[PDB]
Symmetry: D2
Subunit: 182 residues, 4 copies
């Protein structure tokens, strides 16, 4: 039985098993474009719900990365077809943090959005009825929000780690406060 | 740039990177429970559209595996919650091949069903609007159904391989025929 | 509070409130194309789950109809775009009952499929984890499968009515056995 | 044939047929909880694509209403199960207009939020790939945001009405500005 659920991105070069360096099967893995946790996505809700309620997994890691093709896709103002609808959720995130990103040199702006995106997805995860219910009934469950940079493997527990609904709130706010120092 | 979409299972202990020994960078990876391509699942369908239409990928591979928690979770007639709805499509397939699976020794059914699942997911995939258009406008897109087993670490291209609607019908039907040939240790 | 959930089709001319002739607000209403209950559709699962667990509704009616544009769309072998994916589920139903429909004069074949489609959707509904759980915990809950014909309003409780998992099975099988007499 | 898509709420006590007094046959109807158009919801997005691309409908109307069980269910900070995930998008919007809704008398917030919801659903709808392409290729498609109230039985076209990406920006922003004008019985 695995002890981690890894929500990652579909164009991320690095396998999870390299990055966590957990032995094989400690890991349960979902990968979507831009590593989203969308409120109403059955595919991923299901994964979380099974992980949490049935596998009794105790740690969930959302992992994003620099140079992420899906974050690029999202920012591009272009008619890509069905996927554009998937990437609206990232565009909302962008809009939400517009003053912040607006202040950045254009080039460093996608990297900011990868980091921001992770914090927001972690928050969504903590706000699912599965994770809410677990914390409410006293189950041990941690949420983690990592961005890794291809430029020498490096991984940072982006401000977000949460073990409760209270601490989910503190962590995300601090995370955004801290992305906002330039 | 990637030339391959791998649709695989959230259980799979082993990366596509390992399973195909392509350099990581070649693969573009979706993973979900029991490697499904459900007709109306926005998540996977989006992965597929992006890959085919934007990334321009000529090869999609759906890779199931033996000893699969999801398949066993599908067959365990249990009240697991939300996830059961997701695994209902797997039971649809169980039901659809129930005579084959019935004429068969119990401790072998999960693995038969893992193999049958791959056949059907590829059928589903070749019937997405995304893949049909691609094929209709002359794009080069090969779909593959693989199954891997850990005991010996090796794959086998589950008779499923399509480069056309034409060929999808034939390999799908063939896969099911080869699957229906039972070596009598049931 | 309503006492019925009505799952209907989006191109069905007749409002539910005409057909059930329930007073207003006895009714809680979802409408999709070809009145599907798809296993993994969040929109509709949500509706059922809220109806059943929160509104404590005691009757769910899936309602289809003759001359249904969505059933026509499904049968047509044509590139309609995103919707084709929605209508694959109806195409599966068609394939499943191919011998039967194969035997019918082409013209009467879409009407058969509307009827068959309803029985299958009712079954899916009875197989959701929401409805399974309700019956398991002793909640009173009936499932109903109606096809109505524009040609003089007429509505028939298509073989399917279910109040338990056992009776869901008997009813659907009898329903199909009975569609199969020509 | 229909010339109109109505996206409305599963609570609404009243048919679109009544609400618009078009002959039934003109309307093509989707109904879900809190009249949402979620970016990635296959159900509604499919209704929308079919209508726009196949049925060739020049008018989509999203119609919310006062005294809405879904909106109140959204705001009730309660553990309702699966449905809460669906209503999280409504709380996203609550949160996004929290200052407006905070400067406002409690028994009025649900109805403000019903109105704000309609503005946002139409924004979402005009940003679907389906509606953007339509508009880009010169199709005639007007999107409308309405809210009805039973007390007086009448509607009001919630400042939201778009025939272009251009005009969508303007009415959306305008809707929110008119909404932000508070007659002081908060
Ligand atoms: Zn990426
Ligand atoms: Zn597996
Ligand atoms: Zn219809
Ligand atoms: Zn309502």
């Amino acid at each position: 039985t695995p002890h981690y659920l890894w929500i990652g991105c579909s164009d991320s070069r690095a396998p999870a098993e390299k990055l966590t360096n957990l032995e094989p099967g400690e890991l349960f893995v979902h990968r979507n474009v831009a590593n989203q946790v969308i409120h109403t996505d059955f595919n991923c809700l299901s994964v979380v719900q099974y992980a949490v309620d049935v596998l009794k997994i105790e740690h969930i890691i959302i992992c994003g990365h620099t140079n992420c093709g899906g974050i690029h896709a999202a920012m591009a103002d272009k008619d890509l077809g069905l996927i554009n609808n998937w990437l609206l959720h990232i565009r909302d995130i962008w809009f939400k943090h517009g003053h912040l990103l607006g202040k950045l040199s254009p080039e460093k702006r996608a990297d900011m959005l990868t980091k921001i995106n992770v914090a927001e997805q972690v928050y969504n995860l903590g706000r699912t009825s599965i994770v809410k219910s677990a914390w409410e009934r006293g189950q041990k469950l941690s949420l983690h929000g990592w961005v890794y940079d291809v430029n020498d493997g490096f991984l940072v527990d982006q401000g977000v780690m949460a073990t409760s609904r209270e601490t989910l709130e503190i962590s995300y706010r601090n995370a955004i406060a801290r992305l906002s120092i330039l």
